[PDB]
Protein backbone atom coordinates (compact mmCIF):
# COMPACT_ATOMS: atom_id res chain seq x y z
CA UNK A 1 0.00 0.00 0.00
CA UNK A 2 2.69 2.48 1.05
CA UNK A 3 4.98 1.46 -1.81
CA UNK A 4 2.15 1.84 -4.33
CA UNK A 5 1.29 5.28 -2.94
CA UNK A 6 4.93 6.38 -3.23
CA UNK A 7 5.17 5.05 -6.79
CA UNK A 8 1.93 6.80 -7.78
CA UNK A 9 3.07 10.09 -6.24
CA UNK A 10 6.36 9.72 -8.08
CA UNK A 11 4.44 9.40 -11.34
CA UNK A 12 2.31 12.40 -10.35
CA UNK A 13 5.34 14.66 -9.81
CA UNK A 14 5.25 15.33 -13.56
CA UNK A 15 1.63 16.51 -13.83
CA UNK A 16 1.29 18.37 -10.51
CA UNK A 17 2.44 21.96 -9.99
CA UNK A 18 3.88 23.93 -7.08
CA UNK A 19 0.61 25.85 -6.88
CA UNK A 20 -1.21 22.63 -6.02
CA UNK A 21 0.96 21.78 -3.00
CA UNK A 22 1.94 25.28 -1.82
CA UNK A 23 0.93 27.01 1.38
CA UNK A 24 -1.18 30.04 0.37
CA UNK A 25 0.30 33.41 1.34
CA UNK A 26 -2.25 34.24 4.04
CA UNK A 27 -1.59 30.91 5.80
CA UNK A 28 2.21 31.21 5.76
CA UNK A 29 4.05 31.86 9.03
CA UNK A 30 5.94 35.13 8.61
CA UNK A 31 7.63 37.93 10.52
CA UNK A 32 7.94 41.65 9.81
CA UNK A 33 11.36 43.16 9.09
CA UNK A 34 10.57 45.79 11.69
CA UNK A 35 10.81 43.13 14.40
CA UNK A 36 13.18 43.84 17.28
CA UNK A 37 14.80 40.75 18.70
CA UNK A 38 14.29 40.90 22.43
CA UNK A 39 13.76 38.07 24.89
CA UNK A 40 10.07 37.79 24.00
CA UNK A 41 10.38 37.97 20.20
CA UNK A 42 13.27 35.50 20.12
CA UNK A 43 11.41 33.18 22.51
CA UNK A 44 8.32 33.30 20.29
CA UNK A 45 10.42 32.60 17.19
CA UNK A 46 12.04 29.62 18.93
CA UNK A 47 8.74 28.26 20.29
CA UNK A 48 7.21 28.47 16.81
CA UNK A 49 9.17 25.38 15.78
CA UNK A 50 10.14 26.86 12.42
CA UNK A 51 13.75 26.54 11.23
CA UNK A 52 13.36 29.21 8.57
CA UNK A 53 10.88 32.07 8.54
CA UNK A 54 10.10 34.48 5.71
CA UNK A 55 10.71 38.17 6.35
CA UNK A 56 8.37 40.71 4.80
CA UNK A 57 8.29 44.51 4.92
CA UNK A 58 5.08 46.43 4.36
CA UNK A 59 2.73 44.00 2.61
CA UNK A 60 3.04 40.29 3.47
CA UNK A 61 3.36 39.74 -0.28
CA UNK A 62 6.58 41.71 -0.20
CA UNK A 63 9.11 39.20 1.07
CA UNK A 64 12.54 40.68 1.45
CA UNK A 65 14.39 37.88 3.25
CA UNK A 66 14.80 34.51 4.99
CA UNK A 67 15.54 34.30 8.71
CA UNK A 68 17.13 31.04 9.77
CA UNK A 69 16.61 30.46 13.50
CA UNK A 70 20.26 29.39 13.77
CA UNK A 71 21.09 32.98 12.74
CA UNK A 72 19.94 33.99 16.22
CA UNK A 73 22.74 32.00 17.84
CA UNK A 74 24.92 34.63 19.50
CA UNK A 75 22.40 37.50 19.40
CA UNK A 76 21.89 39.08 22.85
CA UNK A 77 18.24 39.87 23.76
CA UNK A 78 19.33 42.86 25.87
CA UNK A 79 20.76 44.58 22.80
CA UNK A 80 17.32 44.57 21.17
CA UNK A 81 18.92 44.07 17.77
CA UNK A 82 16.58 44.88 14.85
CA UNK A 83 15.81 41.86 12.64
CA UNK A 84 16.75 44.07 9.70
CA UNK A 85 20.31 44.11 10.99
CA UNK A 86 20.60 40.37 11.64
CA UNK A 87 19.30 39.39 8.19
CA UNK A 88 22.27 41.28 6.71
CA UNK A 89 24.79 39.13 8.56
CA UNK A 90 23.85 35.93 6.76
CA UNK A 91 23.25 35.09 3.13
CA UNK A 92 20.20 32.94 2.61
CA UNK A 93 19.21 32.88 -1.08
CA UNK A 94 15.57 33.74 -1.71
CA UNK A 95 14.23 31.67 -4.59
CA UNK A 96 11.18 32.44 -6.72
CA UNK A 97 9.30 29.99 -8.96
CA UNK A 98 6.27 30.34 -11.23
CA UNK A 99 2.93 28.73 -10.30
CA UNK A 100 2.81 26.35 -13.27
CA UNK A 101 6.20 24.82 -12.45
CA UNK A 102 5.96 21.03 -12.18
CA UNK A 103 6.87 19.28 -8.93
CA UNK A 104 9.73 17.22 -10.40
CA UNK A 105 11.50 20.34 -11.67
CA UNK A 106 10.98 21.89 -8.24
CA UNK A 107 12.37 18.77 -6.56
CA UNK A 108 15.40 18.95 -8.85
CA UNK A 109 16.01 22.59 -7.92
CA UNK A 110 15.60 21.79 -4.22
CA UNK A 111 18.08 18.93 -4.62
CA UNK A 112 20.84 20.93 -6.31
CA UNK A 113 20.69 23.94 -3.98
CA UNK A 114 20.88 24.38 -0.22
CA UNK A 115 17.47 26.07 -0.36
CA UNK A 116 14.50 24.01 0.81
CA UNK A 117 12.09 26.88 0.18
CA UNK A 118 10.67 28.86 -2.76
CA UNK A 119 8.21 31.71 -3.27
CA UNK A 120 5.38 30.89 -5.67
CA UNK A 121 4.39 33.63 -8.10
CA UNK A 122 2.17 34.05 -11.14
CA UNK A 123 2.15 36.39 -14.12
CA UNK A 124 -0.74 38.80 -13.66
CA UNK A 125 -1.98 39.89 -17.10
CA UNK A 126 -5.12 41.74 -16.02
CA UNK A 127 -4.96 45.20 -17.57
CA UNK A 128 -4.82 47.88 -18.26
CA UNK A 129 -1.54 48.42 -16.45
CA UNK A 130 1.80 46.69 -16.91
CA UNK A 131 1.86 42.95 -16.16
CA UNK A 132 3.40 42.05 -12.81
CA UNK A 133 4.52 39.10 -10.70
CA UNK A 134 1.95 38.25 -8.03
CA UNK A 135 3.06 36.28 -4.97
CA UNK A 136 0.69 33.37 -4.37
CA UNK A 137 2.40 31.60 -1.48
CA UNK A 138 5.32 29.41 -0.44
CA UNK A 139 6.36 25.88 -1.38
CA UNK A 140 8.89 23.79 0.52
CA UNK A 141 10.82 20.55 0.02
CA UNK A 142 8.61 19.14 2.78
CA UNK A 143 5.51 19.87 0.69
CA UNK A 144 6.86 17.92 -2.29
CA UNK A 145 7.99 15.02 -0.11
CA UNK A 146 4.58 14.91 1.56
CA UNK A 147 3.04 14.87 -1.91
CA UNK A 148 5.19 11.82 -2.69
CA UNK A 149 4.78 9.70 0.45
CA UNK A 150 1.11 10.70 0.81
Amino acid sequence: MEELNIIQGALELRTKTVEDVMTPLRDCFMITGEAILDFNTMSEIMESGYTRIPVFEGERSNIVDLLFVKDLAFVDPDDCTPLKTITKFYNHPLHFVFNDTKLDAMLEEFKKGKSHLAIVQRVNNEGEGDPFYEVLGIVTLEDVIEEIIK
Binding site: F98, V123, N124, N125, G127, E128, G129, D130, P131, F132, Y133
Partner: protein, 150 residues
Protein backbone atom coordinates in the same frame (compact mmCIF):
# COMPACT_ATOMS: atom_id res chain seq x y z
CA UNK B 1 17.24 41.09 -11.15
CA UNK B 2 18.91 43.06 -13.99
CA UNK B 3 18.39 41.79 -17.55
CA UNK B 4 20.83 42.25 -20.43
CA UNK B 5 19.78 42.38 -24.10
CA UNK B 6 22.32 42.32 -26.98
CA UNK B 7 21.62 42.72 -30.70
CA UNK B 8 23.93 43.92 -33.49
CA UNK B 9 25.95 46.78 -31.90
CA UNK B 10 23.21 47.53 -29.34
CA UNK B 11 23.24 46.62 -25.64
CA UNK B 12 20.36 47.30 -23.21
CA UNK B 13 19.91 46.67 -19.48
CA UNK B 14 16.39 46.39 -18.05
CA UNK B 15 16.82 46.84 -14.32
CA UNK B 16 14.85 47.31 -11.10
CA UNK B 17 14.22 50.55 -9.24
CA UNK B 18 16.81 51.20 -6.51
CA UNK B 19 16.56 53.38 -3.42
CA UNK B 20 18.88 56.10 -2.11
CA UNK B 21 20.42 53.60 0.31
CA UNK B 22 21.09 51.02 -2.41
CA UNK B 23 22.50 53.54 -4.91
CA UNK B 24 26.15 52.45 -4.63
CA UNK B 25 25.53 48.77 -5.47
CA UNK B 26 23.19 49.94 -8.24
CA UNK B 27 25.94 52.07 -9.76
CA UNK B 28 28.23 49.05 -9.37
CA UNK B 29 25.85 47.01 -11.55
CA UNK B 30 25.56 49.80 -14.14
CA UNK B 31 29.34 50.17 -14.34
CA UNK B 32 29.58 46.38 -14.58
CA UNK B 33 27.33 46.27 -17.67
CA UNK B 34 28.90 49.48 -18.94
CA UNK B 35 25.80 51.64 -18.61
CA UNK B 36 26.24 55.16 -19.99
CA UNK B 37 22.64 56.35 -19.77
CA UNK B 38 19.51 55.62 -17.74
CA UNK B 39 15.94 56.17 -18.91
CA UNK B 40 13.28 56.20 -16.19
CA UNK B 41 9.89 55.46 -17.74
CA UNK B 42 8.02 55.81 -14.45
CA UNK B 43 8.09 58.08 -11.41
CA UNK B 44 11.53 59.22 -10.27
CA UNK B 45 12.05 57.87 -6.76
CA UNK B 46 15.78 58.47 -6.21
CA UNK B 47 18.34 61.28 -6.38
CA UNK B 48 20.46 61.15 -9.54
CA UNK B 49 23.38 63.23 -8.25
CA UNK B 50 25.62 60.34 -7.18
CA UNK B 51 24.72 58.63 -10.45
CA UNK B 52 25.70 61.75 -12.39
CA UNK B 53 29.00 62.05 -10.51
CA UNK B 54 29.78 58.48 -11.57
CA UNK B 55 29.44 59.51 -15.22
CA UNK B 56 25.97 58.08 -15.81
CA UNK B 57 23.31 60.46 -17.11
CA UNK B 58 19.68 59.87 -16.13
CA UNK B 59 16.79 60.77 -18.43
CA UNK B 60 13.24 60.96 -17.08
CA UNK B 61 10.71 60.06 -19.78
CA UNK B 62 7.58 58.74 -18.07
CA UNK B 63 4.57 57.51 -19.98
CA UNK B 64 1.31 55.86 -18.97
CA UNK B 65 1.19 52.60 -17.01
CA UNK B 66 0.17 49.76 -19.33
CA UNK B 67 0.34 52.05 -22.34
CA UNK B 68 2.54 52.40 -25.44
CA UNK B 69 4.98 55.33 -25.65
CA UNK B 70 3.87 58.48 -27.50
CA UNK B 71 5.34 59.32 -30.92
CA UNK B 72 7.57 62.01 -29.42
CA UNK B 73 8.93 59.56 -26.84
CA UNK B 74 9.61 57.04 -29.61
CA UNK B 75 11.49 59.57 -31.73
CA UNK B 76 13.53 60.82 -28.76
CA UNK B 77 14.29 57.21 -27.81
CA UNK B 78 15.49 56.16 -31.27
CA UNK B 79 17.59 59.30 -31.63
CA UNK B 80 19.01 58.65 -28.15
CA UNK B 81 19.91 55.06 -29.01
CA UNK B 82 21.63 56.20 -32.21
CA UNK B 83 23.69 59.01 -30.67
CA UNK B 84 24.65 57.12 -27.51
CA UNK B 85 25.77 53.98 -29.37
CA UNK B 86 27.67 56.00 -31.97
CA UNK B 87 29.32 58.12 -29.27
CA UNK B 88 30.60 55.24 -27.16
CA UNK B 89 30.21 51.88 -28.98
CA UNK B 90 29.85 48.74 -26.86
CA UNK B 91 28.27 50.73 -24.03
CA UNK B 92 24.89 49.95 -22.50
CA UNK B 93 21.59 51.81 -22.14
CA UNK B 94 19.64 51.25 -18.93
CA UNK B 95 15.84 51.39 -18.97
CA UNK B 96 13.86 50.83 -15.78
CA UNK B 97 10.44 51.25 -14.23
CA UNK B 98 9.03 50.91 -10.75
CA UNK B 99 6.29 48.51 -11.83
CA UNK B 100 7.96 46.31 -14.40
CA UNK B 101 7.39 44.11 -17.45
CA UNK B 102 5.36 46.58 -19.48
CA UNK B 103 7.03 49.84 -20.46
CA UNK B 104 10.81 49.38 -20.42
CA UNK B 105 10.58 46.15 -22.41
CA UNK B 106 8.37 48.06 -24.87
CA UNK B 107 11.16 50.56 -25.42
CA UNK B 108 13.83 47.88 -25.79
CA UNK B 109 11.56 45.96 -28.17
CA UNK B 110 11.04 49.06 -30.31
CA UNK B 111 14.82 49.43 -30.51
CA UNK B 112 15.17 45.79 -31.60
CA UNK B 113 12.43 46.07 -34.24
CA UNK B 114 14.13 49.16 -35.65
CA UNK B 115 17.34 47.13 -35.57
CA UNK B 116 15.68 44.84 -38.09
CA UNK B 117 14.55 42.10 -35.72
CA UNK B 118 11.08 40.75 -36.50
CA UNK B 119 8.16 41.53 -34.17
CA UNK B 120 7.50 37.99 -32.96
CA UNK B 121 11.23 37.32 -32.68
CA UNK B 122 11.58 40.48 -30.59
CA UNK B 123 8.74 39.65 -28.20
CA UNK B 124 10.04 36.08 -27.84
CA UNK B 125 13.60 37.32 -27.29
CA UNK B 126 12.37 39.55 -24.47
CA UNK B 127 10.03 37.04 -22.83
CA UNK B 128 12.76 34.40 -22.84
CA UNK B 129 14.65 36.64 -20.40
CA UNK B 130 11.65 37.97 -18.48
CA UNK B 131 8.44 35.95 -18.51
CA UNK B 132 5.17 37.85 -18.69
CA UNK B 133 6.36 41.10 -20.24
CA UNK B 134 3.99 43.01 -22.57
CA UNK B 135 0.31 43.19 -21.59
CA UNK B 136 -2.36 43.05 -24.32
CA UNK B 137 -2.30 46.71 -25.41
CA UNK B 138 1.49 46.81 -25.63
CA UNK B 139 1.51 43.53 -27.57
CA UNK B 140 -0.97 44.81 -30.16
CA UNK B 141 1.03 48.06 -30.23
CA UNK B 142 4.27 46.29 -31.09
CA UNK B 143 2.26 44.41 -33.71
CA UNK B 144 0.79 47.49 -35.40
CA UNK B 145 4.07 49.42 -35.15
CA UNK B 146 5.70 50.32 -38.47
CA UNK B 147 9.54 50.20 -38.37
CA UNK B 148 11.43 52.92 -40.25
CA UNK B 149 14.60 50.79 -40.28
CA UNK B 150 16.34 53.52 -38.27
Amino acid sequence: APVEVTYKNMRFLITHNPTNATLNKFIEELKKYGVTTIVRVCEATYDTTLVEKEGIHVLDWPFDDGAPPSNQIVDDWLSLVKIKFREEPGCCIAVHCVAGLGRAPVLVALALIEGGMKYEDAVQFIRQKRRGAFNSKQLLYLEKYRPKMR
